[model samples]
Target: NEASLLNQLKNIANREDYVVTWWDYGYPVRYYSDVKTLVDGGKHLGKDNFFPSFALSKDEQAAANMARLSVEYTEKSFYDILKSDILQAMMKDYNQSNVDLFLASLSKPDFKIDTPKTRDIYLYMPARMSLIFSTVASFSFINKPFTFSTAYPLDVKNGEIYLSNGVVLSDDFRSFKIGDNVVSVNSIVEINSIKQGEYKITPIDDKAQFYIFYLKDSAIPYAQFILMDKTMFNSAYVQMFFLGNYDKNLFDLVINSRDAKVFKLKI
Candidate 1:
């Protein structure tokens, strides 16, 4: 049923108009689906990948708007402005010097801007990509004001820590160990399915730095505990994939999507 998405990903017609996602799946997502993508293997440098990275880490409404501008700018291409950075070019178009202000301004549902609609935009989010989601959210790390990690996934049993990633879980679930350094935990979340999206959250020390999420569903591979900072916990990617937290008005569930939850960006 993995091929089921491509079956639903019908009617995409354009040239080099791309889907927003990590670079790892850029090629296969393009070649197999008969479409183009933004951050494929060939186009995945920090500057090249920052657009989607920023969008994915922001809130849902912000993510959709940024994604819209990203694809629109890419499809139109910078004629005389800085062609090297799409986000920077967008900053100028939006009349923003500060990225935070720009992102905040676009988040309002009342805000609107016009584009030619040269291409359609979709977020090709596969649940398998959840483990590497930390890496996916890092391209725009330079733009962040804080130093904490966005998201980092560790493969381990529920409540059982592993040695490979150096993440240690206390038997009492009182504290966590990484680098042999004891750190308090803020919350431990549990989930059974991606689309089903029901979840349980256990709040611990409010000041703790890490969030542990357990994916109980056997269908999603490398599915286990996730070590995330507060930033990662609130990011658009985390909410959308981990618990299927997406704004129905801004994004549509494309078909009966599964392990690979594909969302078409809507107004």
Candidate 2:
């Protein structure tokens, strides 16, 4: 079973789009298993063992090379790349605070830089992994840009267009509504039909202690909520990891090994 599972994963891992974002607290750490390298006999020396190679894409490989080269050539260049617009933008997409922590970690003196002769590339293994993860997570667009004008306890009543929060919907958005019982807005016209001002939609159930609004296409204009429990999160995860003939068991093992959590956002 273990060998079969690994084989399944190896097959799936070959695809270009296969990725996984592991949420640590609110921060996301991403990963891509390089099936090419693995099948071709690539290996990385882990703390206690040599693990299958997790190759970075060309762009990511370049970024890692730049960062490592900076460290080797000039400390100033190292810091410059960290503060560079491109890297900063990528980090901002993931979460500014999380980026700050990553920056801090790299600055620590004990940070280990390792070179696997197999690949002949220089890397601060831990930081390089983090960088790769950040790049992948940012690309996934799991984290949307949203600004909320109002606080929580968003209320809605019948016959009224509910715009509980000063939530601006994005162009990518197709609909906005509460639970299944509430009248849902599925069309762009319906979204526009509701005036900018707040309106009373059907009164939400008292049982509904928290008011949750659904956004289509993962485009929430301005709002932030924990994604670990959303359907969108699972759907995205599956699409990224399982849809392309990937091994379900291997995927499960990897997720379980990391104690990864699922989060989703539907715009």
Candidate 3:
């Protein structure tokens, strides 16, 4: 009988014109023969029976509108995001020549930037994160595969480079005597003035760090190195975003959760 009742309920549920009825004052009966019958029969009810549509109240409608607005805001495109005035001013302060040179450095074969066409790019520094312009291809600092033609004396004491004490030597010299008076190399070079036969060193670890940038050809100055701190790395890291659209478009630079900066190249 319970099985029969369930089949009957199913038959009722299947009908588009089906209507519910009761035996007494608001007591269900059309689908019930008893409590067991009601239990077994009710199991066959469809969504239309339990979730009948009705008009939403004023408060409910307002909540619905708010939810729709939230979604609309969240789905907005990156181009529509507001630009930061402070960051824009900061970018404007940078020298145009220096900015141009920095972006060009990334285009070198060694420091090439690889980017996806459909999504934004993320650069992971040691403990920090940077969101690059959407147009960026993949970009990273490259390492040297072999020793340089010219060797230099790199003085490392307690994990620091003693630039003032380092000595530069000719390409033919492979070995040298300790404490011998040697010619010291210039530690810092100008952004646009670096040339062939010149080098700059940055420490990557305790015993070793390679030339940050070695000018192989007098025409191009491409360099590579790891990000050991927030100072120079952050300053140079943001330039990658501008490489793709430095002339016409503006992009965002999110330093962290708390600080997001906007930058665009000056005309």
Candidate 4:
């Protein structure tokens, strides 16, 4: 599946820019497609990867601009006098060193970018990424320890869906079962379509920690339920991958397939 997707990308590899993605697919995205990525398996950590992680874990309006800004800063981090710490490179480039203001400004949908553009940017989001969405967000949750939990799937039984750790979703996804204790479910988010990014968030409890995402109405047993923490719901990974949401001004859809999605950033 990824083979066909990468091969498809080669058709448009004119060498104008780099691809921004979760570092997991770097080796293949570079080896197979003949393009650049922000970070790959070989070089991925907070130093090299926080930008994409930040972009992926932020608002829908924020993701694309973050990609553009990140790509430019990443390029400068190499050739510029700065020691390749992207945030460090960015502070001088943007003429501001205040982390809170920088972050707050970027959080806005219409955050003004100060960096000049060079290489074109791309975002490669695949369908299966939902499986590790929380993990993807962990990179952005830099200061907080274990703020995001690993994504878990539920197995099916007679009209019930259950997780590997003995937590279970009862009929209609109304509540959760943790052995003798019945934990409250905070919400059930139904993603009706990926192509158009249609979703409905239904709140269950006012103070529930457990959230469920209903991705598919599967004929098979227990393929539809994904248990999520609240942090996982807000990231760009969930918005674009699971719901197909992307900012039109910042990114244009290049390839849309069942297996993967490729978008080219607009200058």
**Per-candidate RMSD vs. true structure?**
3.6, 16.8, 28.2, 3.2
- lDDT over C-alpha atoms for residue 171 of model 1: 47
Alpha carbon lDDT of each predicted model: 0.70, 0.26, 0.23, 0.70
lDDT of 2 by residue, 1-267 (tens): 223333434444433222221222111111233322211112122310111111121122222332342222222223443343333433443354564364444434444434221221111112112223323333323114311122122443443334444332332222334333432222221111111212222332333322233322122233222111122222222222111212232222231211121211110
- Predicted structure 3: lDDT: 0.23
Candidate 4 lDDT over residue span 207-238, tens digit each: 88767777664322433556766666666666
Clashing pairs in 1: none
CA lDDT, candidate 2, residue 8 = 37
Best first by TM-score, ranked: 4, 1, 2, 3
Write down the TM-score for model 1. Answer: 0.83
Model 4 pairs whose backbones collide: 197-243
* Candidate 1, 54-153: lDDT as tens digits: 7787778878887888888876674556566666777887678997777678778876767656666777777777667767777756644422222234
Against the true structure, candidate 4 reaches a TM-score of 0.84
**Better lDDT candidate (2, 4):** 4
lDDT measured at residue 253 in model 3 versus the true structure, 0 to 100: 29
